[PDB]
Amino acid sequence: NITTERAVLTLNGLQIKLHKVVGESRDDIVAKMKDLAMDDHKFPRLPGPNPVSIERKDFEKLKQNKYVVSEKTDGIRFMMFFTRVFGFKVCTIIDRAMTVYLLPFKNIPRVLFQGSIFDGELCVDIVEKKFAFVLFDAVVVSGVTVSQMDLASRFFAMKRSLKEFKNVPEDPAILRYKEWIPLEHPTIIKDHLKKANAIYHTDGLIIMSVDEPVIYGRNFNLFKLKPGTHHTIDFIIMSEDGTIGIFDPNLRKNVPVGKLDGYYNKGSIVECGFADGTWKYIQGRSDKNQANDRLTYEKTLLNIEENITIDELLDLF
Numbered sequence: 001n002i003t004t005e006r007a008v009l010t011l012n013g014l015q016i017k018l019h020k021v022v023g024e025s026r027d028d029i030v031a032k033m034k035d036l037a038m039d040d041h042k043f044p045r046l047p048g049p050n051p052v053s054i055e056r057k058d059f060e061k062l063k064q065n066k067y068v069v070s071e072k073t074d075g076i077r078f079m080m081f082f083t084r085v086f087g088f089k090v091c092t093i094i095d096r097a098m099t100v101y102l103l104p105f106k107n108i109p110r111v112l113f114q115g116s117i118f119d120g121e122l123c124v125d126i127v128e129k130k131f132a133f134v135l136f137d138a139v140v141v142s143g144v145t146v147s148q149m150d151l152a153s154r155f156f157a158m159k160r161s162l163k164e165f166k167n168v169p170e171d172p173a174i175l176r177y178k179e180w181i182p183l184e185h186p187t188i189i190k191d192h193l194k195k196a197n198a199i200y201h202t203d204g205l206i207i208m209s210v211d212e213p214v215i216y217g218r219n220f221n222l223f224k225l226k227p228g229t230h231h232t233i234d235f236i237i238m239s240e241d242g243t244i245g246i247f248d249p250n251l252r253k254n255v256p257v258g259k260l261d262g263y264y265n266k267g268s269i270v271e272c273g274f275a276d277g278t279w280k281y282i283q284g285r286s287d288k289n290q291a292n293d294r295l296t297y298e299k300t301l302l303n304i305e306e307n308i309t310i311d312e313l314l315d316l317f
């Protein structure tokens with residue numbers, strides 16, 4: 001059988017009970033995905049890109065090349081993976097740390113089970129108060145490697161495979177498709193970004209290359225933008241007086257980086273925002289025991305300083 005364990009994910013006030021696939025069953029699915037996606041990176045990872053924050057330096061690049069833009073859905077990143085394990089057709093969703101859950105839909109076409117790797121976001125539809133799975137892109141469709149084709153081709157492949165799929169009310173996530181809008185259509189982007197934020201929780205915008213193949217991992221040419229200056233970091237309290245630290249993952253030592261005004265419990269993780277020269281407390285995170293790492297800190301500082309906005313960026317076009 002596939003060894004399961006149950007688990008519940010909470011997003012936006014709503015929760016989904018999923019079977020987390022465990023042990024050797026998890027390991028087989030992962031290995032299957034690694035094969036299908038032809039990924040020979042020695043460290044386990046989803047076959048899809050992780051964005052970089054836009055910087056002022058990239059504005060040139062965007063002006064020379066072709067790019068699409070979309071809302072940055074706030075949810076959990078999942079690679080959706082159709083396959084067969086032990087002869088059985090299995091629809092998995094796998095997260096960035098390579099945690100597998102089954103997510104079953106009644107009417108998935110059997111072609112999909114020849115091997116389909118789609119990328120997306122499990123998220124909540126605000127209007128409907130149900131979960132949605134929003135597809136960004138496809139890497140392999142019905143055994144056919146689509147990743148080296150350009151974006152429209154991949155969507156053409158993905159949308160073809162699902163042409164006959166209909167979601168039934170008892171399915172756990174409504175499947176939906178990211179509507180990608182060309183960066184040279186600002187009025188079409190804004191409207192799309194207005195209508196999108198009626199259905200979903202977003203965290204800005206994603207800007208993606210119209211034609212490059214799929215990148216697995218950090219994609220220096222996939223840019224995210226956070227609306228305005230509202231970036232945060234998690235520090236660890238290194239002293240009861242609020243010396244905040246940031247984690248150096250290769251020292252595995254927390255480095256003293258600032259101080260907060262207040263009394264704090266040493267060892268706690270505080271989410272802080274920058275304002276007027278200092279970090280300010282926003283919320284304590286009882287769910288974390290680790291601060292963010294130096295690179296996220298060094299990068300977030302640059303972002304705060306650059307203060308790119310959605311309106312600057314949308315005005316460039």
Ligand SMILES: Nc1nc2c(ncn2[C@@H]2O[C@H](COP(=O)(O)OP(=O)(O)OP(=O)(O)O)[C@@H](O)[C@H]2O)c(=O)[nH]1
Pocket residue numbers: 049050051070071072073074075076077121136178206222224
């Ligand atoms: N690649 C991609 N990611 C998208 C898209 N829409 C939303 N996202 C999400 O945006 C994330 C971007 O990475 P980050 O900016 O680090 O966001 P995060 O993983 O929520 O982490 P924090 O920023 O620490 O909250 C992706 O991992 C996706 O989960 C999209 O079209 N493409």
